[PDB]
Amino acid sequence: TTSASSHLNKGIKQVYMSLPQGEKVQAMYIWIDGTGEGLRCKTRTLDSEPKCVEELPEWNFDGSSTLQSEGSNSDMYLVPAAMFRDPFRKDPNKLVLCEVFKYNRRPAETNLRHTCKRIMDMVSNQHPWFGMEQEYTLMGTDGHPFGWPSNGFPGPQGPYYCGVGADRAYGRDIVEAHYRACLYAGVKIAGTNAEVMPAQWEFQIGPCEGISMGDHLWVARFILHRVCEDFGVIATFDPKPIPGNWNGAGCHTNFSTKAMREENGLKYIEEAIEKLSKRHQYHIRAYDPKGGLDNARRLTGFHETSNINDFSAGVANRSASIRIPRTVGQEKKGYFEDRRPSANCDPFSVTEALIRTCLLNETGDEPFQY
Amino acid sequence: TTSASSHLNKGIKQVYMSLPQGEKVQAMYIWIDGTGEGLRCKTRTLDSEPKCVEELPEWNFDGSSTLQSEGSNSDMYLVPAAMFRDPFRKDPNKLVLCEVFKYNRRPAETNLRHTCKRIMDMVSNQHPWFGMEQEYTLMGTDGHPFGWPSNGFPGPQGPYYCGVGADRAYGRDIVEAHYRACLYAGVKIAGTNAEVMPAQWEFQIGPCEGISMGDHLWVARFILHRVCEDFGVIATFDPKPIPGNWNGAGCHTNFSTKAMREENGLKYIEEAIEKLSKRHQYHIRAYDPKGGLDNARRLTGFHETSNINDFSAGVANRSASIRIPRTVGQEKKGYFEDRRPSANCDPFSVTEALIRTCLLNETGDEPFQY
Amino acid sequence: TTSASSHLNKGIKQVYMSLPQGEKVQAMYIWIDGTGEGLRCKTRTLDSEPKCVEELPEWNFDGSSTLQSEGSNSDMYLVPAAMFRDPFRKDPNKLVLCEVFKYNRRPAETNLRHTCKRIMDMVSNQHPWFGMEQEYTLMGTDGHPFGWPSNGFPGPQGPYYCGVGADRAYGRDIVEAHYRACLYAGVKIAGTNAEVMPAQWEFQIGPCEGISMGDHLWVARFILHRVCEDFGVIATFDPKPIPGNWNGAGCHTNFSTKAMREENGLKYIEEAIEKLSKRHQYHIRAYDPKGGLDNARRLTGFHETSNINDFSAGVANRSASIRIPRTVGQEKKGYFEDRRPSANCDPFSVTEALIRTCLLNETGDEPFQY
Amino acid sequence: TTSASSHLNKGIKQVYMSLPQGEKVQAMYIWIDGTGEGLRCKTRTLDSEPKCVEELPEWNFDGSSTLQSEGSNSDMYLVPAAMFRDPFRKDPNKLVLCEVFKYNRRPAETNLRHTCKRIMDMVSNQHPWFGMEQEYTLMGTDGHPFGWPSNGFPGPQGPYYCGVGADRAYGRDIVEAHYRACLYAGVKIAGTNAEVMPAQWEFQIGPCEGISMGDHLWVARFILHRVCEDFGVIATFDPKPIPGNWNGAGCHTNFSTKAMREENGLKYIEEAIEKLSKRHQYHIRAYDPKGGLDNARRLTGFHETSNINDFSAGVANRSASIRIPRTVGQEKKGYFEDRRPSANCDPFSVTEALIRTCLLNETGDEPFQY
Amino acid sequence: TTSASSHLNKGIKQVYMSLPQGEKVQAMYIWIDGTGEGLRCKTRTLDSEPKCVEELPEWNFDGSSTLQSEGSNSDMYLVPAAMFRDPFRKDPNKLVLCEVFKYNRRPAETNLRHTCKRIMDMVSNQHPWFGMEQEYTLMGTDGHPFGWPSNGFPGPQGPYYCGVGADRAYGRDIVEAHYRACLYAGVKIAGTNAEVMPAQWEFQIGPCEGISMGDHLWVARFILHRVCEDFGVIATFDPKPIPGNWNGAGCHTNFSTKAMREENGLKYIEEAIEKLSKRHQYHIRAYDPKGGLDNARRLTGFHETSNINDFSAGVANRSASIRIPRTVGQEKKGYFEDRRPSANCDPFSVTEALIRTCLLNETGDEPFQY
Ligand SMILES: [Mg+2]
Ligand SMILES: [Mg+2]
Ligand SMILES: [Mg+2]
Ligand SMILES: [Mg+2]
Ligand SMILES: [Mg+2]
Structure with a gap:
């Protein structure tokens, strides 16, 4: 009734997450896929904690794997739009909601x-x-x-x-x-x-x-x-x-x-x-x-x-x-x-x-x- | 012999509950349903911690779903009566016991x-x-x-x-x-x-x-x-x-x-x-x-x-x-x-x-x- | 689907690992085996925390047990190359990546x-x-x-x-x-x-x-x-x-x-x-x-x-x-x-x-x- | 969900029931207990197969164990009333439905x-x-x-x-x-x-x-x-x-x-x-x-x-x-x-x-x- | 994955079905319910084995329980149409496919x-x-x-x-x-x-x-x-x-x-x-x-x-x-x-x-x- 990954020992994960992070910061990018209902996520490391959403850089992903493009040029671009504190990793990590654009910089469908x-x-x-x-x-x-x-x-x-x-x-x-x-x-x-x-x-x-x-x-x-x-x-x-x-x-x-x-x-x-x-x-x-x-x-x-x-x-x-x-x-x-x-x-x-x-x-x- | 939801990992819930709350406060409203024996509960967010039960606002619920009313106007109202500290979420959250009134402000059965x-x-x-x-x-x-x-x-x-x-x-x-x-x-x-x-x-x-x-x-x-x-x-x-x-x-x-x-x-x-x-x-x-x-x-x-x-x-x-x-x-x-x-x-x-x-x-x- | 050793009680291990270490330091030596894909590890105690990879001593291991040598003289030598903090034992313990050399001081295959x-x-x-x-x-x-x-x-x-x-x-x-x-x-x-x-x-x-x-x-x-x-x-x-x-x-x-x-x-x-x-x-x-x-x-x-x-x-x-x-x-x-x-x-x-x-x-x- | 005795091996029972019986005949007496709802059964051996219900002898049982009598004289008597072929033991064995009478020959309640x-x-x-x-x-x-x-x-x-x-x-x-x-x-x-x-x-x-x-x-x-x-x-x-x-x-x-x-x-x-x-x-x-x-x-x-x-x-x-x-x-x-x-x-x-x-x-x- | 009743002991059922039947014959009536997709079945006892489908009598059932009628007169009638040998109970038992008629003898929908x-x-x-x-x-x-x-x-x-x-x-x-x-x-x-x-x-x-x-x-x-x-x-x-x-x-x-x-x-x-x-x-x-x-x-x-x-x-x-x-x-x-x-x-x-x-x-x- 429950997924196999839920039967793993969570105490080990908590012990690992108790380690001090240091000076790098994790940012998670979230965007809506081609179905218009699902969500996709991605993580990258940042040198320092951003203070506003304007400070985050742009990113990209393969659109052919999310049913959002096809052909020879399927790359897409993510533009940060909103920023929130990360509850799964706590401060100073962040959650980022991003907009999707095509290779020619037009908004996706x-x-x-x-x-x-x-x-x-x-x-x-x-x-x-x-x-x-x-x-x-x-x-x-x-x-x-x-x-x-x-x-x-x-x-x-x-x-x-x-x-x-x-x-x-x-x-x-x-x-x-x-x-x-x-x-x-x-x-x-x-x-x-x-x-x-x-x-x-x-x-x-x-x-x-x-x-x-x-x-x-x-x-x-x-x-x-x-x-x-x-x-x-x-x-x-x-x-x-x-x-x-x-x-x-x-x-x-x-x-x-x-x-x-x-x-x-x-x-x-x-x-x-x-x-x-x-x-x-x-x-x-x-x-x-x-x-x-x-x-x-x-x-x-x-x-x-x-x-x-x-x-x-x-x-x-x-x-x-x-x-x-x-x-x-x-x-x-x-x-x-x-x-x-x-x-x-x-x-x-x-x-x-x-x-x-x-x-x-x-x-x-x-x-x-x- | 035990409920299915009791077999979930409670360490995860404890980890989530360890997060600092912030400045918002949760209040749980409790009232007696139409059978005269059962209880019903509901949660809402408050801007600041209330100091006395008089500071809590009123609320409402659908009476047709609790066997307390029927017809075109089944809305009911909750009036706070007593306040207690919440032991499941700890301070500053509260528990509120409320009285039930009909849409015309008459007490329920x-x-x-x-x-x-x-x-x-x-x-x-x-x-x-x-x-x-x-x-x-x-x-x-x-x-x-x-x-x-x-x-x-x-x-x-x-x-x-x-x-x-x-x-x-x-x-x-x-x-x-x-x-x-x-x-x-x-x-x-x-x-x-x-x-x-x-x-x-x-x-x-x-x-x-x-x-x-x-x-x-x-x-x-x-x-x-x-x-x-x-x-x-x-x-x-x-x-x-x-x-x-x-x-x-x-x-x-x-x-x-x-x-x-x-x-x-x-x-x-x-x-x-x-x-x-x-x-x-x-x-x-x-x-x-x-x-x-x-x-x-x-x-x-x-x-x-x-x-x-x-x-x-x-x-x-x-x-x-x-x-x-x-x-x-x-x-x-x-x-x-x-x-x-x-x-x-x-x-x-x-x-x-x-x-x-x-x-x-x-x-x-x-x-x-x- | 999971290894038997993963079914042991990890709370006991955490309780043991919570003990204060003292003044000795543990160092783990890591090297690449004869297949060119696998890794091998080994632990030893040190009197004090090393400040740089140059302070770590050399070590040795039996090469006939790792498919890296054979015959009468199968001993091999480990030379530290890089040092990292140990995440499984936390500070001041260290991880050491080492190079492998033959008994005549020639690099291994x-x-x-x-x-x-x-x-x-x-x-x-x-x-x-x-x-x-x-x-x-x-x-x-x-x-x-x-x-x-x-x-x-x-x-x-x-x-x-x-x-x-x-x-x-x-x-x-x-x-x-x-x-x-x-x-x-x-x-x-x-x-x-x-x-x-x-x-x-x-x-x-x-x-x-x-x-x-x-x-x-x-x-x-x-x-x-x-x-x-x-x-x-x-x-x-x-x-x-x-x-x-x-x-x-x-x-x-x-x-x-x-x-x-x-x-x-x-x-x-x-x-x-x-x-x-x-x-x-x-x-x-x-x-x-x-x-x-x-x-x-x-x-x-x-x-x-x-x-x-x-x-x-x-x-x-x-x-x-x-x-x-x-x-x-x-x-x-x-x-x-x-x-x-x-x-x-x-x-x-x-x-x-x-x-x-x-x-x-x-x-x-x-x-x-x- | 099913009885413990239903988990016993039934091939063994069939093997035992395959044994030829001989000359003796089994008769099972059935009667209604003191609740007016349940049934009770009892088996005895007969020298030869009975042809009509009039050939079967009378029997008795302890009424204090079936909620049908109490005191110093709780013995009850069974009088055969109808006879059927036994489907659980097959011919020539019989099922007998009996009437219950008190120790003084009055019918039971x-x-x-x-x-x-x-x-x-x-x-x-x-x-x-x-x-x-x-x-x-x-x-x-x-x-x-x-x-x-x-x-x-x-x-x-x-x-x-x-x-x-x-x-x-x-x-x-x-x-x-x-x-x-x-x-x-x-x-x-x-x-x-x-x-x-x-x-x-x-x-x-x-x-x-x-x-x-x-x-x-x-x-x-x-x-x-x-x-x-x-x-x-x-x-x-x-x-x-x-x-x-x-x-x-x-x-x-x-x-x-x-x-x-x-x-x-x-x-x-x-x-x-x-x-x-x-x-x-x-x-x-x-x-x-x-x-x-x-x-x-x-x-x-x-x-x-x-x-x-x-x-x-x-x-x-x-x-x-x-x-x-x-x-x-x-x-x-x-x-x-x-x-x-x-x-x-x-x-x-x-x-x-x-x-x-x-x-x-x-x-x-x-x-x-x- | 399989039904609960499929876990019952089947040797017992075979033993019971090995009993000789006698003179009476079992006939199973089959008809199509109100969905036009499902089938319903029903069994009755006959005095002697029928030789042709014309010898079988008519029957009836409650149509309100099969979504084939409603109201004060929901009784329907079964008219045999074809006869086959019964493979689940063997000879001389029969399977009967029947047509459904309303209480006024009009054919069902x-x-x-x-x-x-x-x-x-x-x-x-x-x-x-x-x-x-x-x-x-x-x-x-x-x-x-x-x-x-x-x-x-x-x-x-x-x-x-x-x-x-x-x-x-x-x-x-x-x-x-x-x-x-x-x-x-x-x-x-x-x-x-x-x-x-x-x-x-x-x-x-x-x-x-x-x-x-x-x-x-x-x-x-x-x-x-x-x-x-x-x-x-x-x-x-x-x-x-x-x-x-x-x-x-x-x-x-x-x-x-x-x-x-x-x-x-x-x-x-x-x-x-x-x-x-x-x-x-x-x-x-x-x-x-x-x-x-x-x-x-x-x-x-x-x-x-x-x-x-x-x-x-x-x-x-x-x-x-x-x-x-x-x-x-x-x-x-x-x-x-x-x-x-x-x-x-x-x-x-x-x-x-x-x-x-x-x-x-x-x-x-x-x-x-x-
Ligand atoms: Mg990749
Ligand atoms: Mg007492
Ligand atoms: Mg709702
Ligand atoms: Mg075909
Ligand atoms: Mg009935």
Whole structure:
């Protein structure tokens, strides 16, 4: 059920990691591969500790091995974008999130941060804030959810949501380790809780301003993957890992601007929702790496989910595409929540689509070029 | 016999937890679900360490997932009530016990603290003190008591009560960890001992004044559940886990007021016992989440238990519904013990019933409204 | 799958190693055996900590037991050459790399450092720099790659290159321990990454000047072997451990001189490549302990490999024998990479061949004597 | 999951059973113990093979060991009632079903055949026929249904009813062996099928005339118990072995007389149903060894069950207390089915109650004495 | 990997089944459930051995448990259609294939034999013959192909087609037992062979005239399911059990009439192929229980498969929709092969579609009514 490498003696590794480092510094480069969902990592040595991301040098990798290029010139380039403290090796080591460029210096197909940053720069004065709730499921190496009976199912749902106990919460050690690691690294993690389906968990990232939302979410995903690798289990972001009566995984997003946060911002909130109501198909396309095929299995209308083909909104409505918190309605200001995005969505795409539809008043089936 | 998540490497978790936290603080919210017996937990990040429970903000959760609401408006609200140090994450993190309210700000069905607080406030000048002895049994994940032979039984009772040795005490590590964690968290734990049935233990909480007794007992139960989850076993509060000659689990309660603690308080103790003798059915109803069905399996009159259908009292009588300690009788003052409450009772209900019957002189089959 | 000695309790060993050492110092002597691939080690006690390699004494060993001599006089002598901090015993203990000599003080057959040092001394003023990328595969004690299914294969290649996750990276603990140990010991390790074939990794050593490259690479190999022994697995440098579609292991080498590193050094780089193009067979002979038989299984022309029988070169060409980085071509200066050397090559031989062909303008089928 | 004795080598047992017997004959006496649910067996040697049940001698046993007597005179007596061929030892050995009498020759409290025989004799000229469908569940020695995931559940119901395949039918070998053994012994077994709940099966007995129905059903139950003992599993007749959404077990009974079977017997069927409609509580009391408490867990009104508190009848109605098959309604003659009896019912009690209510026109809350 | 019930002792079952039966006879009724893919079975006792299928009585079952009806009248009826010898219980026991009818005697939705029989009767004078090659895969109870490495893959395809040896053929015991059982029962089995993908096999049925083809194929499928259940494995007819480079499963069908079999029948074969070329979508719809979705995963145009979207035909072409054997072309008479049908097809649907298109000259998107 667990990987072979997880059965090695970890005391030896701790003893080795207790050695003083010296004066060299390790930096780990992270980037998104050609599938648009996976991550790749790489390590290099630095003479001294960098103080800002601008001080890190550029690097490169073979694109033909990551399904990002082919032919005689498959080399690609990594440009640092964000820097965080390394929780697996501690200070002064660093984690670096990088953008991918082709040999001719054009952004790669899956490099969606390049356009998102430019779009965000156009509405900086409005100070858009974001918050996302990432749900995921822990799986064993055999493809079965962690802690489930062999070739079987646990009891019916109901006792696992926010549950406590050896028979209600599965793999809380991973959750605690991930929370502490994210706090140490500097990620803006807001909370966690156990979900309805056993072995399914959730963590919230935010509030984040502008482009930092995607950086924080991607770094959190990478940290979760590394922690699960340490424990020997697999973390999956599939929107519907188990068919049937079991719950799916979503990536609900909170959105607000300076106008909405101010008293009587409910008018702007309703204006934004009205604008969003006319681009349901476009947003559904932008909320899935596969263009919407994956989210179809999740958004069926059953359980507390909204149908994929229909748009709806309301106040304190958990079955609607867009939900307005009751507190926001009472205090006529705040934010609104979008419940459509899938668990394996790309935050850059979601934020860019929201900004384009709500603030830039874009219309049609394609994005503007500016 | 043990949960799958208990077989993960705990050294890795310790290494992760050794990381310095920084400046953010974690707070865990705890509340009672719709069954009136289980507990639910949730974590969020705070900007700075709170100094008093009044500084914590409110929160909310989906009531339809905890069998506490249904329909279009299932949102519920959590209001902090008590704060304790977190023993699983250490300082400056906190544990928070919260009350549950409906979307219209009315207390939920299982929110019994709301009325208990007012009832206690009505008689604050008398300074009522409480003390409860919680008994529980450790179980494996297969439903069999921890340490018992597979599909079998241990030797007859007699050597296990307060026993020491590998063949007499089962799971003392859980007991020691729970004791130390409760002491660290600030819970008013008074002692522990092994019980007659193997794998059955007990801990005493008190003396506590007024409403604090329920808070302390609930927090102790939550800590026990978390510790057992860490070790991979299950702690059950069922009054009669194993049918037959094996002992049940009770929640004996001690009660006294300022008058009873002074000289010649035995007169007031006897008056209170006489008052209690006329509301046996009411108290039996109030001493069980199921209205008394569960306690029927325990209170059969055999062993050192009193019959459910008959009320009795005496001095140094272990088979009576109410017992007066011999020392109290000799010194004409002190307290008296109620042996009726079941292991899975709700402390708020028990304390409220005792206060209503003994101090407010209430009568009838229903509580007063005031 | 793991060695028996790896199942011993390592906590006991750590407890023993925690004892204070005192005033004596341990020194470990390392030398290359008669096969030209393996390493041998030996420990002795010293009165005080040596400050430089010149202070260490000479030693000896029985050559008949290492396939390095035979007959009546099989004794051999060890002469210290380089000193490093000991990462397995920490300071003040040391690691010592030694040369092997016969009973008559003539260098042994596998002692290639003797000639390499003189050759490097002949061209010291030009300041040649080197950099090598060592690839290796982790194997179980049963001869199967670590983490692979029993008598089976993992999924097709593509997700493992620079992968993260319990199902994409095998044995990262060994890699982390080796990296930290190399950093502590003073080896000039530059980076690491996961390779295309699962359970295959690599690390980069450099830049190193002159003879130090071989010392650093050999010490890194020894440290890797010791770490893998601690974890209970085997590290193999075979160029083609698994036949079929799975990738082989190489030892790509970077080379540059003072002239090449200055402005318009591309001219000298091209001249060196032109010189190299005429000694393909000689270099292939010098790049393999077996004379080229082992490298035949790797250099087949398929995948990202060049054919053994044909020489080629180009800019940003990963299928050529010699590759010129695109950045170097753009900035008309830098270094060039040789992709022919096998994983189990001897760094001294490779560096000596490169120096002889490029700087000394040697020709013919045999090396010059001077 | 299986018995320890089931792990003994069975080839040895077969070799021993291959020995020729000789002249002596083995007879196994079977009787119902004091719980009214279990069976007890006992073997003795006979000089020659008996041809009729009248040739067998009487026997006795200690009643204090079977909860059927106590005190100074606890000896009970066995009187043979029916004889069958022995399928476990083959011819000429026999199985004998016996009645239990007290030391003073009065029938035992659990001996219901004594009165049932007289009641049947009173109405012999009407030729009442009976048929019963016995449902049961196969369980492991650990208390979990055979073949279910450990501490878990299989998939939802729907594919297991009359299913075929390794993932749809559990323990078919027991069913096949029991069928063949019943056919060999002479029991009037009519068919079998897999039931809705996995590991749940069913077999039909009949048509049987008068008192032979109970004898045949009891012998079939004993044979099933012996076969399951041979295989190492447990057969349980509990009406609701698994709480929740899983189906219970019933003992539906068929009934008809000579008048009903003739042309236009539907009139008599309707008269009998009308009579039965006024003794629902009496029949519920008679259909359960515990007086109706066990059947309460099954007859909840959900699934294909009727409510215990209400009586209903109809044609081709599977949710009613009494069902008239559609073919019977079309042809105006045949039988009707009673779906109330529990799986662990006593056939003698059921048949006696049906005869008393339908043919003898008895009324009131107690049986007549005659 | 294998079922729990497969671990029960089988010598006990053989001993029980060695008992002489007697006069009564067992008959097993078989029918197709509401999914159109699965089978259900049921056993009853008969007084004497039936000689022809006309002597067997009708039966019934609850349709609400097989997804074939719902509501107040869910009772269905079984009408015997074909009879075979029982290989699991031997003579004189029988297997009975039955048709399903609703409570009003209308055929069920999945009862396709009713219309197929009439269609065959309309063209009886032309003597159509059929033959099918059923492919299947053996799976363990964990969902992985039988004999494959745990969480892994075997070597690449190429040595498994018609292979012999412990490392090339998996589960040949099931194949041998199924062959012998089919021969005993009277099924017209023509041969078997191991397929390209390891653990994949195939058997051929035919030549069969008219309606008997479907009966024979269904009985063979049932026998295979029972044998696999005996061995504890699962046989799956999924057209693409393993995604990727592994071969799918098909049900290639042969077809010919009296005119085609005569001299110069190639003209009629070509006419039939020309007719078939214009109803590709109709036949694709008729060749899959799901209307063509399952076959989409198989007919991708790669390997020895044709594209689902295109129709093609040729002589000795394995990549075409229709193949004319080279021997048939040389001899100018014989048959042609249709390679489109899926492995989980319904033979009645396939044969009916072929007859309607080729002999009745039907056109359009719907079948005629006659
Ligand atoms: Mg959530
Ligand atoms: Mg006690
Ligand atoms: Mg490489
Ligand atoms: Mg039934
Ligand atoms: Mg084939």
